Design the sequence.
């Protein structure tokens, strides 16, 4: 029944964090010890959450952007009563534990997104805040405040130095995300040592200039009243995102506090013993949480638990007065798609750019899938991600119900924000940009793959087809890179029908991110295209019995393969295989793959990209050998030898070299 | 006659408009908006010689907002550079010297290749660092042989990119006083008004970053203000400068001030009206008044005299400082002092290749004075600052320092390395964890495209990282870098190969190199050799009439060697070390055939995904997905990257494809 003082709670946190890192013989004790005071106040007095229900949809979201200090989050999750035991803590950074080196979504209860790569968390948080603001504007009604929570995000010096972070904070300021509260742990230390070695900005002046309401707590090591007031002011102030700048001593309490030595290595048994004694704690007991400290957390959680119950009742009344909205709310938060959407997608007609084919799909999808939310990185009129017929409204501080986000020229932040939007629940996010600049955001793309986020990237201008912009704008090696990436779908549709198929696949992939590679130039529609085919990854668009050659292609090059096949009609019986998504094809059973790419039959692949990686399917490739050039698309295709005649010549030589079932077996056949 | 500054600017505007119109593609907006500032900068302030684009002490000019390159092409022509009116008429056309975006080497006077937003600014920071460092290294009392400014144009898009923000942050921290950023603020982007996604108080923001911000409220017609801004910029010391000029995109056009003039030809009619509005002939295109040309010529004559005087100063300097003079000339040519390779370390004890790299740098730093490196806040992990080198950090108070603390800014670091290389006199390298090179692919791609000699010291190359987990363990990045044209990805197995890797990187004048280094110790191989690394792949363990080949790289070579020994009684096995696939593919067919003979089954071993290995091996022992959080040793067993797994795979392969029946690889019959 006795309640520990806020200081006792803070010191308990500091020590548990230290023991966690020590037990793992690896980790970062520094930051966790420095942010303990703020965490104590935040987790036992301010933040709204239920440790018995991590899935409560109206809970405040918490994100630790400086993921290396996750020992702190694990300690807090345990003390608060989440399903994370002392055994989990003792398994820190060890094989198969629920407590890996950096926060991982799904691995640990209470962790919203996976961080570690600096700057990502901050951008994820911006996405989490955008989601709350948009859903509140969409579902809230007079007398029914069913969506109302804050987004709290910890970050360090490392985070602020990263461009992805600067991009996100910039957009957050512009969007005036008032419920976003960034807690910046300023302790003047990084791996190299003092921050003055490479980072000396007037942060307060800087973030105010970016539209942030900055609140300083000069002594974040012991000023509990300051910490309390800072959070209260942050919640009270409106119209701007907040940034609480607390000045703290990294590794506070340790003999090596305030130095880079406590950044990423265990403090050691002796130093830990002195730290405990210094705080008046037993220097002999490890992983020891006082029962009166647990009582403080329990009292807080009981209050929030009551809030949830009260919230559940409100949603019940809400659902009664608004049957339809209630059903939608429940449906969106589950990520369910209104039925009948796929059948509404467009099919081939006139020759158009798959870029336009994507727009035609969004013209149908926006109205059919209210959860859909997306935008472009200042390439709206180029990516064609905002169909006029959809009558879209831009998301802004003055129109939070808007569904189109103007990301500005911020590819990296855009992709990281998409992860945040997905992590929230109730949103199906997509973002557009030129395929070549997805390279600017591979840091976020990788995390979408690791965290199993359903995010969609509308990547237009996918090749030399771009034309005049030149080599710096023409991808030739990026698709290969994305294809090497685990759990990532890279779909390159050939026409309207395959494009609708691509969106269908992207939308139904609940745990896999998808890159839609779209062309700038028109492509000729194929009569053999189908959504069912796209779902299989690869399939025949042109078949013939007892085939002597297979020509596999994707996107804008399928027409070349088809024409090449015609030109070879009299000589060879050629099958043309459209392969929009290699990841889906590889996942098909052996019998299906054997039926598409029969062993022993020579295969020629055609794609305006480098050949790297194609050896797993073809015996010869007609594509790029280097970077592009500045000239009209048509000129570039002839220039680089990516033509029908070249395909015909290559197919002819292959058939000649490997006649009747003698084509070299590929690794997949005997693997 | 001497055209007034306004006539010069209007001439620039019209030529840019005709250039874009002639290509039936391009961006006329920004070019027209920055004509006024350009007229002043190029005919009154900037020091350069159009008759000698290679003059080493010339001011540098970068157009970070590369889409508006029509402006730079117009300026280069009017200034007298080797770019004719025909080149201009070839704008955005096949094989012309005037591509859609500035391309290094393709056009005279273009310092770096821009197009991808934010890169130009970062490059400029690198150019400014190089100048400051070279000045501190070579200047002597009375001998100011290195002294020039770095001018860089940028727009709203540039300032929104993280790589730009990272670079400006470091520029402010380093107090690069000779860096002058000219920011064209016209409140317009592709989507339209900047108020749709960009509303920062730039003045206060950049002052907070350490910049001296100068504003020119009317950059469309206030020439006195423009002249004053540049003058103030040159006079103000201790901080980089950002001149914020407010202009009207497409000034003069009927669609001025709108996104419509952003990236589409103005049209024949609007162009005619623009000329008439400026008192110019609405019928003549690509027309440069002779009095405007005389203005540029007068300026170039002066700068030309400055170069000659500079050449004389360098001659006196060389007479008073024989050694330094020789070094200056040599460095500016990118020449390496002889004897450096022979000093590199060879195998000894088992150490991480990360440590092996440090041992190399301990020799290279003192042997190659032009060498300048740093790490993205990972110095104690990348081991890029060998204590014996007695290095000093580059800072505003120590410009002669050779080590750069980039902070947690991988992207800007890489773009800055490109800028350092573009300047001349510097051999740059930057370090960070391999996994985060992924944050900098934008700049890495341009190093490959522009043929920059930059070296990336990328440590913690795999699950060898251990405890940090999947977010820090690369499994797919190397494949991505291998797919990239003109990029060398070297993964040395031990000290000797690591010395070979550095040798290759340092001698590749036109190709960037990524050094994939291990965190954990690796076992040295008696078969390793520098000659082998230069060949990409070579046998480290050979046997006559082989039945199986095991190819591997980096820390996995020891697994292949041990697997080979384990198979001793069963199969005749050759072990191939493949530290660099790019160099191997470049070898003649006879050499490749000799290393990986056709018909012989091949097993590759590497702690990365298999994507791409099919071009060499018939089976792969490596990663099938992302990593996990646990000690390295535990991870290798967990994922099956062990000697027993290699032995088991080699056995099944030799069994399935005995004596010459192994499937032929594409390269063999290609
Ligand atoms: C993108 C990225 N680059 C580099 C790293 C390596 N790294 C981990 S923590 C860190 C610096 C930590 O500094 P900071 O955020 O200031 O806090 P500290 O824990 O030292 O207080 C770095 C560079 C990383 N995790 N992510
Ligand atoms: C990294 C990157 N992302 C996107 C683009 C596409 N792009 C080219 S220009 C531009 C708009 C930039 O506008 P700005 O520099 O503000 O000036 P304007 O010419 O419209 O005045 C965009 C988004 C690009 N070139 N590079
Ligand atoms: Ca810090
Ligand atoms: Ca602009």
Sequence:
């Amino acid at each position: 029944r006795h309640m520990a003082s806020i200081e006792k709670v803070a010191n308990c946190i500091r020590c548990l964090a230290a023991d966690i890192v020590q037990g793992g013989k690896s980790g970062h004790p520094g930051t966790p010890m420095g942010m303990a005071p703020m965490s104590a106040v935040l987790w036992t007095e301010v933040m709204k959450y239920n440790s018995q229900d991590p899935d409560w949809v109206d809970r405040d979201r918490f994100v630790m952007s400086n993921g290396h200090g996750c020992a702190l989050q694990y300690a807090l999750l345990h003390m608060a009563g989440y399903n994370l035991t002392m055994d989990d803590l003792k398994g820190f950074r060890q094989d198969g534990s629920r407590t890996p080196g950096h926060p991982e979504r799904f691995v640990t209860p209470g962790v919203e997104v996976t961080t570690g790569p600096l700057g990502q968390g901050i951008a994820n948080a911006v996405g989490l805040a955008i989601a709350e603001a948009h859903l509140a504007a969409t579902f809230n009604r007079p007398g029914y405040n069913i969506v109302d929570h804050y987004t709290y995000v910890y970050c360090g010096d490392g985070c602020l130095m990263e461009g992805v972070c600067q991009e996100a904070l910039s957009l957050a300021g512009h969007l005036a995300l008032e419920k976003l509260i960034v807690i910046y742990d300023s302790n003047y230390i990084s791996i190299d040592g003092s921050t003055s070695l490479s980072f000396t900005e007037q942060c307060h002046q800087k973030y105010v200039a970016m539209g942030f309401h900055v609140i300083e707590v000069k002594n974040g090591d012991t000023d509990y009243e300051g910490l309390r007031k800072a959070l209260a002011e942050a919640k009270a102030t409106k119209g701007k995102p907040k940034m609480i700048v607390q000045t703290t001593t990294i590794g506070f309490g340790s003999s090596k506090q305030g130095t880079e030595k406590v950044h990423g290595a265990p403090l050691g048994e002796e130093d830990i013993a002195n730290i405990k004694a210094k705080f008046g704690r037993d220097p002999q007991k490890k992983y020891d949480v006082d029962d009166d400290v647990r009582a403080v957390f329990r009292m807080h959680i009981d209050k929030c638990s009551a809030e949830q119950k009260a919230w559940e009742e409100l949603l019940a009344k809400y659902t009664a007065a608004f049957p339809a909205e209630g059903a939608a709310f429940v449906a969106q938060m589950r990520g369910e798609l209104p039925s009948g959407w796929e059948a509404k997608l467009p099919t081939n007609s006139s020759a158009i750019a798959t870029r336009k084919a994507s727009e035609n799909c969004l013209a149908v999808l926006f109205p059919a899938i209210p959860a859909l939310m997306g935008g472009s990185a200042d390439l709206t009129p180029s990516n064609l991600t905002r169909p006029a017929s959809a009558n879209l409204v831009d998301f802004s501080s003055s129109s939070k119900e808007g569904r189109y986000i103007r990301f500005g020229v911020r590819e990296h932040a855009m992709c990281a924000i998409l992860n945040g939007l997905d992590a929230h629940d109730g949103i199906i996010p997509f973002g557009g940009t030129f395929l070549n600049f997805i390279g600017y955001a591979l840091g976020a793309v990788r995390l979408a793959a690791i965290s199993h986020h359903r995010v969609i990237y509308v990547a237009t201008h996918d090749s030399i087809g771009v034309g005049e912009d030149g080599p710096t704008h023409q991808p030739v090696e990026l698709v290969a890179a994305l294809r090497a990436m685990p759990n990532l779908q890279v779909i390159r549709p050939s026409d309207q029908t395959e494009t609708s198929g691509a969106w269908a696949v992207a939308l139904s992939s609940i745990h896999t991110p998808t890159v839609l590679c779209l062309s700038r130039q028109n492509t000729e529609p194929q009569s053999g295209s189908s959504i069912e085919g796209v779902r299989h990854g690869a399939y025949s668009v042109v078949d013939v019995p007892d085939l002597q050659l297979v020509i596999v292609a994707s996107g804008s090059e399928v027409s070349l393969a088809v024409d090449a096949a015609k030109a070879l009609s009299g000589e060879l019986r050629v099958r043309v295989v459209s392969m929009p998504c290699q990841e889906l094809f590889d996942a098909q059973p052996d019998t299906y793959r054997q039926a598409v790419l029969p062993a022993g039959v020579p295969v020629v692949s055609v794609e305006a990209y480098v050949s790297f990686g194609w050896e797993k399917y073809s015996h010869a490739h007609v594509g790029m050998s280097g970077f592009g050039a500045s000239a009209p698309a048509g000129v570039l295709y002839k220039k680089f030898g990516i033509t029908v005649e070249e395909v015909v010549r290559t197919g002819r030589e292959l058939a000649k070299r490997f006649p009747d079932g003698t084509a070299p077996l590929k690794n997949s056949s005997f693997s």
The first strand of chain A starts at residue 61 and ends at 64. The pocket of calcium ion (ligand 3) is lined by residues A 156-157, 187, 189-190 (CB under 6 Å).
